[PDB]
DNA sequence: ATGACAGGATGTATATATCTGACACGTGCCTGGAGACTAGGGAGTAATCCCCTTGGCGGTTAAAACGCGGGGGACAGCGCGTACGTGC
């Protein structure tokens, strides 16, 4: 069970906060380094990485959907 | 932060002297090309026929075709670990 993976993905994206945002590749490598499965739950991450762009907590920098770069909200 | 505009420096191209050997030219020769004639055969030509290709006629559906849909594909966007590219 454990906590839902939204908190895990927020820790993964808040770990670095590069000026050019994290790729989907680098964030799933961070989640795999954390230990969360990224191979069978990649549909769950696939929907989560656009749900988080949609709800406004995180904004997408340069890519589209779950592609490209990502950064935190202004406030 | 990003793109627009100038400049140098050395590598590559630009202009000029050298030499050399290899393009090029000159010579021996004998092989090579071929004239006459022939032997003899391949091959062009007539013809014909027949059968195998061309031409046509009726019925099926196999195939073509057309269209709606749906889920698969194609390929860009961007990042990132990387993997040679490159100086020495």
Cβ A13 vs Cβ A58: under 8 Å: yes
Cβ A17 vs Cβ A72: under 8 Å: yes
CA of A53 to C1' of B40 (A): 99
Resolution at which this structure was determined, Å: 6.4
Strand B at less than 7 A from CB of A63: yes
Experimental method: cryo-EM
Cβ A50 vs Cβ A35: under 8 Å: no
CA of A51 to C1' of B52 (A): 76
CB-count burial class (<10 Å; 0-12, 13-18, 19+) for A61: middle
**Tokens, residue A8:** 């895990």
Cβ A61 vs Cβ A69: under 8 Å: yes
Distance between CA atoms of residues A3 and A65, nearest Å: 24
Q: Which nucleotide is nearest to A62 (CA to C1')?
A: B78
Cβ A60 vs Cβ A13: under 8 Å: no
DSSP A41: T
């Amino acid at each position: 069970s454990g906590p839902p993976v939204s908190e895990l993905i927020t820790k993964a994206v808040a770990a670095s906060k590069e000026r050019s945002g994290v790729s989907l590749a680098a964030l799933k490598k961070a989640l795999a380094a954390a230990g969360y499965d990224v191979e069978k739950n990649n549909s769950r991450i696939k929907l989560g990485l656009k749900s988080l762009v949609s709800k406004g907590t995180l904004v997408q920098t340069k890519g589209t959907g779950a592609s490209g770069s990502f950064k935190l909200n202004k406030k």
